[PDB]
Structures are given as C-alpha cells and as structure tokens.
C-alpha cells in the first residue's frame, strides 16, 4: 500500500495534490509516499520539505505511479489524444482520486475503466454538512472569491478605499456581487477589507442575512420567489425570463453607480444564468470592471471570453480560467486535505488495506468506476 502524487502537466495548472502536513499523516496510516520531482514548485512546495515530512521522491511521472497502489491528482489525467497518455502510466488496478471532471468528460472515464483502475470524483461530493472538510468546490471557490477582488483591483484604474486628503476626497469604489455562495461571500469580505461599499444579490433568501453580517447591503428582488428559490441540495434553480427582468430592473439602479461587478452565479447541470447583458454594460461607468467567475460554465455576462480580458463600452470584462490556480500555493494544501479527509475513514490500518465503505453516501456519490465497471447513476 504505497501512494504517489505526480506533477500537473496541464497548461496553467499549478496546483499539486500534496503537502508536507499530509504526507506525515499518510505515513501514519501506512503509506510509502512517493512524489514526482518538482511537483510542488507552482505551489511553493519544495522536494526537501516533502522528504522531511516523510516522502520518497520519484524522478519522473512513470516512476512515481509505476507501483503506486493509490494516486492523487488535482485535475483529470490527460488521455492519449490530449498528448501524453498519463492514464497508462498508472499501475493497473490502482485507485485514483481527483477532480476527474466526469459527466462532461467521458473519454477519460472509459480509459481508466479499461485498466481496472477504481476512480473517485470529488466534484460530486454530497451537499451534507459533515462532508465540508472533504469538499473541493468550497475550498477552491472560497479562494477564487478572494482572487476575484484582487483581479478587479488590479484591472481598475482607481483605489478601493475612501481617503480624505489635502488634494480632496478619494471616493470609495462601489462593488456589486452577483451570487453569494462560497465565492461571493469571500468577495464581499475581501472588498469590504479594502474599503469598498458593497452591494450584493442572490436568488436564495438566506443570503440576505449573510451579506449584512459582512456589512454589505442586499438588493431584494424577492418576487415572492426567493422563498422557493433554494432547493433541498442548497443550490439554485432556473428562475425564469420574467424574474430575470424583475431582477435586471432592480439591479440597474446600483449597477449604473457600480465600479466593480463580480458575478459568481452557477446552476448545476445547466448553463450559467445571465445577470449582466450587453445592454446593461452600456449603462455602466467607463473604467468599470466585471469579474465573471462563471465564465467556464457559459458566463454571467455574455461578453466574457475564457482566458481573456474583453474591453467593450469602456468596461473591462475579465474571465480568467481556473481562478483557484491563480492562488495555487494556498489552494493545493487545502485540496490535498480534502482528499485526505475523504480517504482516512475507510483505511483498515491493521493489515494496511483500503475498504471504501460503499454504504457511506460520501463513497457512493463519487465512485465513477470500480474494477472495470462504470457503476454510476449518470
């Protein structure tokens, strides 16, 4: 029972799925912990720090995975047609834990299934309170929320905080956060830290109080629909074209005076809802900045383009990809601990085995393939 963690070969992907803290814990469970050379450079994790914590170091990707009974990655492994065939480097019959993508990534799933590899998809983690320590959406989107404000302030040609000065008063920047989940709450907090006046909106009723606790002001649209907007899962549903219009009119009174708009709204299995149309952008002040964190799921603004900064109507619409990788040295230790917390409960220890419960909904709401069978309710 030995575990190995490779470096990320994907363009821009700087997060590693390991840390000194975690390898120390894996050793305790009964793991020989090999790690690919220089795998934590983008995360500012050195090889020497891995060793001291209790990790052997492989000099390549094929050498790390060769005899590894378990493999931890961040993003899905690349397939033959993507370039290098990482799936084949993995010893057959091993277990693989990462953001395998799944649902929207079928090539990778059948290839890992061809080599008996039992893989677990962390994005599908149940929305129950006890799984928050194993939950990669929350750990990563929290940091993306912070990073949105940092990217907004970087692109903006003004200062955030009010400053009374001998040359006159620098006014505070006004920020509007669209969607107040994990990312939106951190964007409010980080914008308020920097001295901005912060406005917020969401379709779920319970958001109102969360915004006020952070000192933001909430834009009630209600439509009576905010009571029945949140689901049993805690995620939003499609609200409708009529509400969208009721929302757009209410939003516009603040949006005209808004300097930074941060949009974070997501709907599971569906395109991202449109919150700021090109018409609404035309009413905005020149020098304004939109940060679209939902860009890889369609976008909350249709003018956003993934991996680019778009300028139209004197407004910068920013749509970076993989925002959590822009905070890679914080993201990675947290990702590796999500995985550790998911895995630890199902280790025998005495005979050094790994019996993944099966009955535990954490386990079954995650296992995409097992010993050559895809086994999932797609």
């Amino acid at each position: 029972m030995k575990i190995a963690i490779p470096k990320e070969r994907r363009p821009g992907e700087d997060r590693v799925a390991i840390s000194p803290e975690v390898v120390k814990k894996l050793v305790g469970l009964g793991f020989e912990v090999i790690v690919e050379q220089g795998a934590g450079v983008g995360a500012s994790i050195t090889d020497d720090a891995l060793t001291a914590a209790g990790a052997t170091i492989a000099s390549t990707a094929a050498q790390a995975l060769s005899q590894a009974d378990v493999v931890w990655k961040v993003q899905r492994p690349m397939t033959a047609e993507e370039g290098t065939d990482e799936v084949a480097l993995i010893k057959e019959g091993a277990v693989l834990m990462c953001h395998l993508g799944a649902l929207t990534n079928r090539p990778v799933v059948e290839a890992l299934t061809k080599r008996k590899i039992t893989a677990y998809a962390m994005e599908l983690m149940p929305r129950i309170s006890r799984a928050q320590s194993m939950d990669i959406l929350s750990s990563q989107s929290n940091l993306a929320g912070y990073r949105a404000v940092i990217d907004g302030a970087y692109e903006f040609a003004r200062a955030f905080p009010m400053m009374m000065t001998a040359a006159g008063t620098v006014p505070p920047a006004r920020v509007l956060v669209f969607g107040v989940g994990v990312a939106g709450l951190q964007a409010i907090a980080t914008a308020k830290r920097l001295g901005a006046v912060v406005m917020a909106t969401d379709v779920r009723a319970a958001t109102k109080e969360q915004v006020e606790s952070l000192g933001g002001k909430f834009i009630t649209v209600d439509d009576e629909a905010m009571k029945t907007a949140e689901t049993a899962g805690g995620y939003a549903k499609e609200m409708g074209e009529e509400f969208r219009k009721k929302q757009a009119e209410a939003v516009l009174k603040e949006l005209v005076k808004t300097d930074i708009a941060i949009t974070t709204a997501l709907i599971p299995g569906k395109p991202a809802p449109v919150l700021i149309t090109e018409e609404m952008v035309t009413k905005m002040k020149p020098g304004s900045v939109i940060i679209d964190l939902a860009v890889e799921a369609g976008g909350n603004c249709p003018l956003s383009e993934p991996g680019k900064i778009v300028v139209k109507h004197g407004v910068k619409i920013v749509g970076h990809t993989n925002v959590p990788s822009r905070v890679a040295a914080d993201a990675s230790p947290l990702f590796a601990k999500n995985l550790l917390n998911f895995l630890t409960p199902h280790v025998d220890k005495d005979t050094k085995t790994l019996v993944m419960k099966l009955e535990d909904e954490t386990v079954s709401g995650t296992c995409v393939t097992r010993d050559g069978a895809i086994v999932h309710p797609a």
Partner: protein, 174 residues
C-alpha cells in the same frame, strides 16, 4: 495656567446632548483607540443622539490615515464627513469630541499670520457648545505650537491615553 479635567463625567455630557461631532487625529492612531471610539458612538445612537466624525484633510500622518482606522472599527461611511461639508455644523452641536487631534483644530491658522500653521484651513471646533480634547498631556502637535482652545470657558481636557480614556467613558455610559 490651563484648565484640566479627567475621564469622569464626559460620558453623560454626550449622553445628555442632542448632537456630538467626533474629531479624530494622529493621537487616536498612535493609541489605536478606534474600536473603543466606534462603540462609544453607537451606544449614543441607541440613546437617540446624533453622532458624526469630522475628518481634516491632513489628520494623522498620511492621506486617509483616519479613514483606514475608522473603517477597521466598522464606522459607517454615512457618518464620516470632510472639512468642507462639516465645518458649518459645529455651530449647531453641543459637543466637540476631539480625540488625538490638535493642529487640525488650531485657530492660529486663521489668525496669527506669522505662524507655521497659517493659511491651512482648520475644523472650527470652538463654535460647538462644548469641546473635549483627549490627549495624554498638554504637549504640542506636529506644528510644535500651542493651541488657544485648551484654555477657554467652553473647553474641557481629558488627560489620558486615547484608547484608555475612551474605554473608560464607554463603561461610564452603561
């Protein structure tokens, strides 16, 4: 030759008044007295008293010095006013709560032509019914000149650290 005064009894003066203007300065920043200041303010609003903060363009030692510290103590923006929008309101206020400011209030800027602070517009805190200066001692400010306001009938000094004095005043407000 100057009039003194202590922590005691400045709490009801403001509690009884209808209106109070807080005038923070460098000394407030040195003591980090701002969290105590904000709690002293909203106990007043809970009483129905109207509170305000008057910010001189050059309070503290950098641009926006008072703003960052007041923001850290969560003072609302709608209560913070620049010298030009607040100066006339001192006429209508019962109390001028000056905490760690000095040069910013000094009338020799309007009078005394041959002075180092001359020509710099100041906050007209004297026009308030009563003026309280919190500072540790009678010592001067950045200009290194005396301030006439410390010794007249409408002024009372509070001689203590700005953090300590204000904390004490909050306890007397309860």
């Amino acid at each position: 030759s100057v009039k003194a005064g202590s922590a005691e009894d400045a709490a009801f003066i403001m509690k009884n008044a209808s209106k109070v203007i807080i005038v923070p300065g460098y000394g407030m920043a040195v003591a980090q007295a701002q969290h105590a200041l904000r709690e002293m303010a909203d106990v007043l609003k809970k009483e129905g008293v109207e509170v305000s903060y008057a910010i001189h363009p050059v309070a503290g030692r950098m641009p926006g010095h008072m703003n960052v510290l007041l923001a850290e103590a969560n003072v609302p923006y709608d209560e913070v006013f620049e010298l030009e929008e607040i100066n006339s309101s001192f006429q209508t206020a019962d109390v001028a709560f000056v905490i760690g400011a000095n040069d910013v209030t000094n009338p020799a800027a309007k009078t005394d032509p041959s002075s180092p602070i001359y020509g710099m517009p100041i906050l007209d805190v004297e026009k308030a019914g009563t003026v309280l200066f919190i500072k540790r001692s009678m010592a001067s400010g950045y200009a290194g000149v005396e301030n006439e306001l410390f010794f007249r009938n409408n002024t009372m000094m509070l001689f203590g650290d700005a953090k300590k004095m204000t904390e004490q005043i909050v306890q007397a407000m309860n």
